[PDB]
Amino acid sequence: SSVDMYIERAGDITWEKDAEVTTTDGVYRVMTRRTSGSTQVGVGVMQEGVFHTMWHVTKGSALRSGEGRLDPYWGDVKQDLVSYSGPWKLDACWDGHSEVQLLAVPPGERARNIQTLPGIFKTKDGDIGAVALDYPAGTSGSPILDKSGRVIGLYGNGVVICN
Amino acid sequence: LGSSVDMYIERAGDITWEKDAEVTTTDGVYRVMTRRTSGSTQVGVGVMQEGVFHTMWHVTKGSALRSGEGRLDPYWGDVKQDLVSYSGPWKLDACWDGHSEVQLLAVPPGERARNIQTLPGIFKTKDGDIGAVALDYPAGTSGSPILDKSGRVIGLYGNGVVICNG
Ligand SMILES: Nc1cc(N)c(/N=N/c2ccc(S(=O)(=O)Nc3nccs3)cc2)cc1/N=N/c1ccc(S(=O)(=O)Nc2nccs2)cc1
Numbered sequence: 001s002s003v004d005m006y007i008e009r010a011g012d013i014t015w016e017k018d019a020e021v022t023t024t025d026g027v028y029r030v031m032t033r034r035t036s037g038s039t040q041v042g043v044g045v046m047q048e049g050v051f052h053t054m055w056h057v058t059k060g061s062a063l064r065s066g067e068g069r070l071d072p073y074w075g076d077v078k079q080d081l082v083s084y085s086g087p088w089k090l091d092a093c094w095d096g097h098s099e100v101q102l103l104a105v106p107p108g109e110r111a112r113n114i115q116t117l118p119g120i121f122k123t124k125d126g127d128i129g130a131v132a133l134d135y136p137a138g139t140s141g142s143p144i145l146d147k148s149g150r151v152i153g154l155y156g157n158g159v160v161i162c163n
Numbered sequence: 164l165g166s167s168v169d170m171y172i173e174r175a176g177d178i179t180w181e182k183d184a185e186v187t188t189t190d191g192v193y194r195v196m197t198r199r200t201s202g203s204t205q206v207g208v209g210v211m212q213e214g215v216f217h218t219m220w221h222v223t224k225g226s227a228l229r230s231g232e233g234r235l236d237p238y239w240g241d242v243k244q245d246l247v248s249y250s251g252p253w254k255l256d257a258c259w260d261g262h263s264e265v266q267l268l269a270v271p272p273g274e275r276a277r278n279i280q281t282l283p284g285i286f287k288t289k290d291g292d293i294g295a296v297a298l299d300y301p302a303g304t305s306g307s308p309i310l311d312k313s314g315r316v317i318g319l320y321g322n323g324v325v326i327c328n329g
């Protein structure tokens with residue numbers, strides 16, 4: 001048997017006004033089915049009919065969904081990204097100075113917003129952000145949001161700065 | 164001053180092809196560890212070859228590392244390639260033929276190093292064709308070396324397998 005991977009909608013993607021501080025558009029759990037039952041392997045974002053997640057979560061596997069089978073459209077192993085059904089749509093960038101919110105969706109746990117200041121690390125062309133928190137395996141792909149609710153990164157990836 | 168990580172490496176084993184694998188600071192393979200208020204966690208893996216430590220850029224964010232020898236400074240780094248080398252230029256130049264089985268020398272957090280023989284898939288990227296290992300391991304296994312039959316490192320787990328022609 002090949003791995004039976006599917007997505008389930010977990011909630012809306014919204015900035016939460018008083019967060020904790022350290023089918024349709026939304027945030028989805030990426031699940032695997034075994035005879036013994038289901039495991040969450042990651043998270044992703046449906047935007048403009050395109051499902052976005054990390055390449056390591058699916059390794060280009062087709063996904064079952066409420067809308068039928070989703071086939072991979074584009075991916076990059078090095079950036080660790082993959083899109084289903086169409087081109088990559090998550091084009092927002094972090095300004096490199098505003099606090100962000102991680103919309104963490106860990107396995108077997110409630111979706112929640114956590115406000116956090118990314119770390120900044122120097123690169124040769126500039127700087128990149130990091131949200132490295134203590135979340136369980138399977139949280140990778142959780143969206144990182146700016147104050148307008150735009151997805152500026154996925155949990156486990158560097159947060160790209162444009163400034 | 165700014166954001167910093169307290170990172171260190173620990174040798175996990177020799178890098179060798181294992182003749183009868185399951186089929187689905189000396190040179191060697193190392194765990195990359197980070198010290199946080201919660202404790203020390205493995206965040207990835209890398210390869211010491213010819214006195215140069217090699218890992219994926221995102222594992223270390225290009226940070227200096229502590230080792231048995233003292234401080235290792237990043238020498239070369241590329242966020243786009245997601246690679247970084249310490250102490251000297253990138254030394255891992257072997258490529259996959261695009262058809263032979265390979266071995267992942269997986270070094271997962273809290274688990275023994277082990278060799279798994281597998282056949283990479285081949286995927287189209289804007290740069291060209293690349294191989295990729297279709298085995299699932301936890302995030303902190305990223306950087307584990309992928310080996311050809313002569314024990315040469317032809318890729319790092321999560322970074323793809325380099326194909327000799329395009
Ligand atoms: N100054 C430098 C000093 C170094 N020590 C160094 N090492 N480099 C490596 C590059 C690739 C690989 S690898 O694939 O073989 N991965 C693995 N091999 C075994 C295990 S993993 C390994 C090492 C690179 C340097 N500069 N490099 C540049 C590369 C590209 C471009 S580019 O503009 O042309 N963009 C692109 N186009 C198509 C693709 S990238 C500009 C500059």
Ligand SMILES: [Cl-]
Nearest residue numbers: 295296321323
């Ligand atoms: Cl890989």
